[PDB]
Design an enzyme around this catalytic site. Structure first.
Site, PDB file in Angstrom:
ATOM      1  N   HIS A  41       0.848  -1.235   0.000  1.00 48.69           N
ATOM      2  CA  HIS A  41       0.000   0.000   0.000  1.00 48.69           C
ATOM      3  C   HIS A  41       0.870   1.265   0.000  1.00 48.69           C
ATOM      4  CE1 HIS A  41       0.029  -0.289   4.588  1.00 48.69           C
ATOM      5  NE2 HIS A  41       0.322   1.009   4.406  1.00 48.69           N
ATOM      6  N   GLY A 143       2.603   6.091  10.031  1.00 49.09           N
ATOM      7  CA  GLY A 143       3.946   5.916   9.450  1.00 49.09           C
ATOM      8  C   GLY A 143       4.649   4.693   9.996  1.00 49.09           C
ATOM      9  N   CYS A 145       3.866   1.596   9.408  1.00 52.66           N
ATOM     10  CA  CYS A 145       3.755   0.464   8.455  1.00 52.66           C
ATOM     11  C   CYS A 145       5.130  -0.010   7.992  1.00 52.66           C
ATOM     12  CB  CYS A 145       2.896   0.842   7.263  1.00 52.66           C
ATOM     13  SG  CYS A 145       1.153   0.731   7.714  1.00 52.66           S
TER      14      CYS A 145
HETATM   15  C1  LIG Z   1       0.916   2.467   8.157  1.00 51.27           C
HETATM   16  N1  LIG Z   1       1.633   3.513   7.887  1.00 51.27           N
HETATM   17  C2  LIG Z   1      -0.469   2.609   8.780  1.00 51.27           C
HETATM   18  C3  LIG Z   1      -0.473   2.122  10.225  1.00 51.27           C
HETATM   19  C4  LIG Z   1      -1.708   2.582  10.994  1.00 51.27           C
HETATM   20  C5  LIG Z   1      -1.895   4.097  11.062  1.00 51.27           C
HETATM   21  C6  LIG Z   1      -2.524   4.332  12.427  1.00 51.27           C
HETATM   22  N2  LIG Z   1      -2.113   3.157  13.197  1.00 51.27           N
HETATM   23  C7  LIG Z   1      -1.660   2.153  12.450  1.00 51.27           C
HETATM   24  O1  LIG Z   1      -1.248   1.045  12.880  1.00 51.27           O
HETATM   25  N3  LIG Z   1      -1.408   1.828   7.985  1.00 51.27           N
HETATM   26  C8  LIG Z   1      -2.490   2.370   7.411  1.00 51.27           C
HETATM   27  O2  LIG Z   1      -2.732   3.578   7.417  1.00 51.27           O
HETATM   28  C9  LIG Z   1      -3.474   1.396   6.788  1.00 51.27           C
HETATM   29  C10 LIG Z   1      -3.368   1.399   5.272  1.00 51.27           C
HETATM   30  C11 LIG Z   1      -4.609   2.086   4.738  1.00 51.27           C
HETATM   31  C12 LIG Z   1      -5.539   2.404   5.896  1.00 51.27           C
HETATM   32  N4  LIG Z   1      -4.844   1.843   7.067  1.00 51.27           N
HETATM   33  C13 LIG Z   1      -5.323   1.699   8.314  1.00 51.27           C
HETATM   34  O3  LIG Z   1      -4.625   1.201   9.204  1.00 51.27           O
HETATM   35  C14 LIG Z   1      -6.742   2.207   8.586  1.00 51.27           C
HETATM   36  N5  LIG Z   1      -7.575   1.113   9.065  1.00 51.27           N
HETATM   37  C15 LIG Z   1      -8.403   0.455   8.258  1.00 51.27           C
HETATM   38  O4  LIG Z   1      -8.603   0.729   7.095  1.00 51.27           O
HETATM   39  C16 LIG Z   1      -9.081  -0.784   8.840  1.00 51.27           C
HETATM   40  F1  LIG Z   1      -9.857  -0.500   9.884  1.00 51.27           F
HETATM   41  F2  LIG Z   1      -9.827  -1.399   7.918  1.00 51.27           F
HETATM   42  F3  LIG Z   1      -8.172  -1.642   9.276  1.00 51.27           F
HETATM   43  C17 LIG Z   1      -6.825   3.436   9.514  1.00 51.27           C
HETATM   44  C18 LIG Z   1      -8.300   3.860   9.616  1.00 51.27           C
HETATM   45  C19 LIG Z   1      -6.015   4.589   8.906  1.00 51.27           C
HETATM   46  C20 LIG Z   1      -6.294   3.121  10.922  1.00 51.27           C
HETATM   47  C21 LIG Z   1      -4.332   0.643   4.391  1.00 51.27           C
HETATM   48  C22 LIG Z   1      -4.034   0.390   2.925  1.00 51.27           C
HETATM   49  C23 LIG Z   1      -5.224  -0.414   5.010  1.00 51.27           C
END
Ligand SMILES: *C(=N)[C@H](C[C@@H]1CCNC1=O)NC(=O)[C@@H]1[C@@H]2[C@H](CN1C(=O)[C@@H](NC(=O)C(F)(F)F)C(C)(C)C)C2(C)C
Ligand SMILES: *C(=N)[C@H](C[C@@H]1CCNC1=O)NC(=O)[C@@H]1[C@@H]2[C@H](CN1C(=O)[C@@H](NC(=O)C(F)(F)F)C(C)(C)C)C2(C)C
Lengths: 302, 305
Positions: A41, A143, A145
């Site tokens: 992603h 950030g 991820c």
């Molecule tokens: C990586 N940089 C982040 C880690 C997240 C950010 C907040 N805490 C974390 O662990 N990953 C993401 O932003 C991923 C990424 C898009 C959206 N996302 C999410 O973690 C979102 N959650 C969801 O979509 C859910 F609920 F379905 F899991 C968010 C609402 C921003 C927390 C992708 C491609 C999933």
């Protein structure tokens, strides 16, 4: 003596952390040999976070669209491929800090360390377990991820987790290093929720064995149980059913303490009935389930 | 979101851990520049341990009595001296992995990361607090001595602890890297006990702020207390008194959460007087005191090293 939630030394993993940028998305990458592994992603913009077509997004990218930075150094990306939900960037430099490593897929109950990273820099190391519902109760901000989960066995790092997402209950989902999600989750911002979580019963029993080895017997009783009576009671406290595999794995702790596995199950049964009544076990007024039988033997050897 | 007991990344410290053997005693040393630091009790035989004369043991030993191994490499010891309870071994080689470092002495309540090691080999890392009674609730087996405690500030490692001993209660005592004990302890095989511990109040309040930042809010009430009223209830439950300093340190968390410190004091007072009523906070049934205000701000902000 003593019993600590304890993580593996993070140095071998620190030496592998890079910053990966694609367009305006930056997250962390794991640089092993001449490959950088990171969440696919990274190739998403804000809009296509719902139904990304990763193949279509990836085919539109050139090697030179990927900023890989290790400290000061920009690495040269000379290849990109996708495996399940991880992006593999071939780079023109083997990482000289590459430890002995393997990729391993873990099962719920298994523990591991997380090196929480931002912009390719480590913030912290903590100890996790894969929950029965295939989530981890991590500590991860924007950030985070590409932060990874690992075990270290002698000098070999077993990468078991790469961080991808946070679910609505504040719990976390990710992949093995082959890009296969733990549990039914997808790397899309579509409606997803963790299933009801259960207590890792084998791990609670291990921790009760650690309590005994550290010299606490207050919670033992003169009872035993059948495996089946135990599971019927445990499941009413949202405890994972204990399997024969789980009984076998408690064998060594059973031998070291002289407490039969089914005797300790009897203790757990009574603990679930009565609670702690102000008492603690190993500095906890909860039953701890993020220590495996193996973690307990490693900390409680002597 | 999420909140974990988080250690500093241990890499800068792992590059400094070596094995020190004197006679049949093996433990860990910290190799910084051309000096290896370790507990002086490494020189002790079973006899010595009971009533050691360290100065005398030390001067009767050649440099070659100290086997220092960094992995498969033997270091050459060209000098040895005592500073309080730490042995300093001068080696002929500067550690090429020496990070930017200083020796720091920490206060009770302050937290740090322990890199548990055996035979110079890092085994585990955990986050600890210096208890008010100057012990640490560690996890340490035979051979763990010379395991170190540290903080990281930017790229500077602040070494604050070297592990020396385990007290009868299963808790741990050690020195700063200048060999000054934390607490009223001595490096002799002799009956010693931890004094009674108290709860690090300022840390509990920081942890309640961490709970609130992660949506764990049930223990908040509408009431406000005063330092004096809070401190009278605090002392009674063996909680460290809360100072205006402690209050000022929480200001950032107070401002971020919209929960005033003396409100969180009212919530903490109720929790001491009422327990948690079968509830948890950040997955604990007990009030946690091993997160500082700075720990909570750093973890909740995503500070890196
Ligand atoms: C990586 N940089 C982040 C880690 C997240 C950010 C907040 N805490 C974390 O662990 N990953 C993401 O932003 C991923 C990424 C898009 C959206 N996302 C999410 O973690 C979102 N959650 C969801 O979509 C859910 F609920 F379905 F899991 C968010 C609402 C921003 C927390 C992708 C491609 C999933
Ligand atoms: C160093 N490698 C060990 C670490 C210990 C061993 C078990 N768990 C630990 O943390 N340190 C020692 O063995 C020190 C050392 C002599 C004896 N000692 C102790 O830790 C002993 N404790 C005490 O004598 C007491 F109670 F006073 F603290 C022991 C009974 C072996 C645990 C010296 C010089 C203190």
């Amino acid at each position: 003596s003593g019993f600590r939630k304890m993580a593996f030394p993070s140095g071998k993993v620190e030496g592998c952390m890079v910053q990966v940028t694609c367009g305006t998305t930056t997250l962390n990458g794991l640089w092993l040999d001449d490959v950088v592994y990171c969440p696919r992603h990274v190739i998403c913009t804000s809009e296509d976070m719902l139904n990304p077509n990763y193949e279509d997004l990836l085919i539109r990218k050139s090697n030179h669209n990927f900023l890989v930075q290790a400290g000061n150094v920009q690495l040269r990306v000379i290849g990109h491929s996708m495996q399940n939900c991880v992006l593999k960037l071939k780079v023109d430099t083997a990482n000289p800090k590459t430890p002995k490593y393997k990729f391993v897929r873990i099962q719920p109950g298994q523990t591991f360390s997380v090196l929480a990273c931002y912009n390719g820099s480590p913030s912290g190391v903590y100890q996790c377990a894969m929950r029965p519902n295939f989530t981890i109760k991590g500590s991860f901000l924007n950030g985070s991820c590409g932060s990874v989960g690992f075990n270290i066995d002698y000098d070999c790092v077993s990468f078991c987790y790469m961080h991808h997402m946070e679910l609505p209950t504040g719990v976390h989902a990710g992949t093995d290093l082959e890009g296969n999600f733990y549990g039914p989750f997808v790397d899309r911002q579509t409606a997803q929720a963790a299933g009801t979580d259960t207590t890792i019963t084998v791990n609670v029993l291990a921790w009760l064995y650690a309590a005994v080895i550290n010299g606490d017997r207050w919670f033992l009783n003169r009872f035993t149980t059948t495996l089946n009576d135990f599971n019927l009671v445990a499941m009413k406290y949202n405890y994972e059913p204990l399997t024969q595999d789980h009984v076998d794995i408690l064998g060594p702790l059973s031998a070291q303490t002289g407490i039969a596995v089914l005797d300790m199950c009897a203790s757990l049964k009574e603990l679930l009935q009565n609670g702690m009544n102000g008492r603690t076990i190993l500095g906890s007024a909860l039953l701890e389930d993020e220590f495996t039988p193996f973690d307990v033997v490693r900390q409680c050897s002597g």
